[PDB]
Amino acid sequence: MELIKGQALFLELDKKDFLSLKNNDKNIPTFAHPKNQEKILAIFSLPYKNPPQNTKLIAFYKDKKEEIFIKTLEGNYKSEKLQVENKKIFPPKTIQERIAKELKEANAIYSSYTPKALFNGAFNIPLNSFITSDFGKARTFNEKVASYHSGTDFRAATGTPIYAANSGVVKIAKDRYFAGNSVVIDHGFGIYSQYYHLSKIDVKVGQKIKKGELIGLSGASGRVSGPALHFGILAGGKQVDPLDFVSKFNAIFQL
Amino acid sequence: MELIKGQALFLELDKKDFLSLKNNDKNIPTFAHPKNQEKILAIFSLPYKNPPQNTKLIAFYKDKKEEIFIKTLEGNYKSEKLQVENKKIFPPKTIQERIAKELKEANAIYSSYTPKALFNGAFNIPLNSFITSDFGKARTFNEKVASYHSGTDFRAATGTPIYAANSGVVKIAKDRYFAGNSVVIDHGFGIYSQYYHLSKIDVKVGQKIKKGELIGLSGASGRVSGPALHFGILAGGKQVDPLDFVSKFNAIFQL
Ligand SMILES: CC(=O)N[C@@H](CCN(CC(=O)O)CC1CCCC1)C(=O)N[C@H](C)C(=O)NO
Numbered sequence: 142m143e144l145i146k147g148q149a150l151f152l153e154l155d156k157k158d159f160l161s162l163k164n165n166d167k168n169i170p171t172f173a174h175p176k177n178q179e180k181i182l183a184i185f186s187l188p189y190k191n192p193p194q195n196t197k198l199i200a201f202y203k204d205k206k207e208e209i210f211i212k213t214l215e216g217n218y219k220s221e222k223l224q225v226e227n228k229k230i231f232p233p234k235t236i237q238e239r240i241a242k243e244l245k246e247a248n249a250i251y252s253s254y255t256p257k258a259l260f261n262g263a264f265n266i267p268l269n270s271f272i273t274s275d276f277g278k279a280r281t282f283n284e285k286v287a288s289y290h291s292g293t294d295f296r297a298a299t300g301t302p303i304y305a306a307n308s309g310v311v312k313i314a315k316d317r318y319f320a321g322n323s324v325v326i327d328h329g330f331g332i333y334s335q336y337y338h339l340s341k342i343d344v345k346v347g348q349k350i351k352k353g354e355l356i357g358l359s360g361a362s363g364r365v366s367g368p369a370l371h372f373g374i375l376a377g378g379k380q381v382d383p384l385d386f387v388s389k390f391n392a393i394f395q396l
Numbered sequence: 397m398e399l400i401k402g403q404a405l406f407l408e409l410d411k412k413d414f415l416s417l418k419n420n421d422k423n424i425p426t427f428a429h430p431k432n433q434e435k436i437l438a439i440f441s442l443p444y445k446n447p448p449q450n451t452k453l454i455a456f457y458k459d460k461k462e463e464i465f466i467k468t469l470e471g472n473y474k475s476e477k478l479q480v481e482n483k484k485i486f487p488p489k490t491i492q493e494r495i496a497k498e499l500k501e502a503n504a505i506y507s508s509y510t511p512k513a514l515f516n517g518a519f520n521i522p523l524n525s526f527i528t529s530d531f532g533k534a535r536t537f538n539e540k541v542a543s544y545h546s547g548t549d550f551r552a553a554t555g556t557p558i559y560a561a562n563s564g565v566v567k568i569a570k571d572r573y574f575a576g577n578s579v580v581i582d583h584g585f586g587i588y589s590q591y592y593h594l595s596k597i598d599v600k601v602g603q604k605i606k607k608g609e610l611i612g613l614s615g616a617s618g619r620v621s622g623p624a625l626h627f628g629i630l631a632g633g634k635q636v637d638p639l640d641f642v643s644k645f646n647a648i649f650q651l
């Protein structure tokens with residue numbers, strides 16, 4: 142198989158006699174196929190930065206091993222150079238401390254795996270406008286990816302209502318240094334939707350949210366150049382192409 | 397405060413001048429807050445069956461009492477009314493003796509309270525699969541709750557490796573009537589994890605186990621309808637929603 146970096150892929154495996162699915166030592170979780178009682182699914186994602194050329198995954202059964210080979214692909218992401226870089230411009234300590242705490246908090250959440258579906262059907266798009274900045278916009282240096290765009294931005298004037306893309310549990314609902322007013326929902330199975338740069342948060346941590354419920358209002362808060370809604374999906378442990386993911390997910394799960 | 401039956405809640409209290417926290421007559425133990433040195437914690441659990449509508453706790457300090465009110469919610473559990481062709485006759489006499497003796501042994505263990513932490517940070521789920529039968533699915537013969545599912549079952553084919561959810565000391569590691577092959581671990585502070593219906597046990601009573609370590613193999617043993625791993629948590633003296641509890645626990649104790 143093949144896969145563009147920063148994308149997720151839904152793997153299908155036989156349910157019967159299945160023990161585990163592994164990428165080296167790291168285990169990869171499995172969930173039931175919705176339309177086929179004899180199958181299970183697993184999500185595999187390639188990081189945007191520094192992917193391997195190739196992945197070999199092993200599905201272990203009672204009676205056999207099934208190898209799965211996945212070649213990384215570069216894709217057609219847009220990319221610009223940078224002309225200066227090295228141990229430069231950090232913030233004040235209590236601000237580094239803020240940056241550090243929030244990273245830790247976020248990583249704890251994205252590491253967590255809720256082993257049931259908190260979603261309800263297909264993902265919807267969080268609002269009905271148009272993309273102004275695509276997933277995977279890179280910035281490069283030493284021919285390496287210095288940074289990339291880890292979600293997709295939708296055009297939004299300040300104050301535009303923003304609806305949960307699917308059902309779930311709110312894990313984050315506060316102001317953060319980079320993302321600004323942030324909401325993050327757990328949908329189950331390590332799948333997380335992200336809504337950043339809001340002007341107003343209308344949910345709180347722990348709250349169960351349904352698909353199409355209002356989570357807040359768009360803004361320009363946090364590290365961003367203007368008002369816009371930033372939409373992200375983390376799955377299989379990584380940030381991946383949100384519209385690509387949604388499209389893959391809904392292929393399997395649409396009710 | 398509000399709490400759903402069959403859930404645990406972490407109460408935070410001022411450390412200094414604290415003498416005692418009580419629910420009527422019974423004392424509720426307390427342990428240190430892991431981050432904030434000025435605070436202590438307690439765990440309060442409502443039973444699933446026959447909770448009171450309301451609970452009032454007093455925290456006694458040197459110079460004041462402090463009331464904590466907790467109102468029981470019914471929550472949203474699944475529930476199938478029970479046909480009664482006759483809720484009448486029992487199983488044999490040395491078998492009833494088996495049942496009674498094992499119940500007596502388990503209560504001894506669950507009544508204990510080890511006053512220090514045996515865990516090591518956050519809990520993991522004991523394996524990377526999906527839920528096939530949730531906690532709190534009840535069977536309601538007429539108007540009372542006859543029985544309910546006291547843990548959560550994960551899809552597992554017979555032979556699936558099962559890992560300790562946190563570090564601890566093994567208290568039970570043997571075949572019991574209803575649970576089948578059973579491992580139960582003391583994590584400290586009266587928190588116990590449960591692993592039932594196993595096909596093979598790989599630990600001994602009294603053994604020190606580390607989080608992520610192999611405890612045994614999944615199975616179909618005991619009172620269960622097919623292969624599966626059943627995962628439970630006891631805390632505050634009652635069986636509580638184990639994914640909810642894990643999530644609450646990790647929020648405080650994650651390293
Ligand atoms: C990668 C990512 O998801 N970036 C986000 C927030 C940052 N944070 C992620 C999280 O905490 O979930 C991680 C930080 C990395 C180093 C320290 C913490 C963001 O605001 N992206 C750009 C600017 C944007 O949104 N353009 O529109």
Ligand SMILES: [Zn+2]
Nearest residue numbers: 292293294371
């Ligand atoms: Zn963006």
Ligand SMILES: [Zn+2]
Nearest residue numbers: 547548549626
């Ligand atoms: Zn069970």
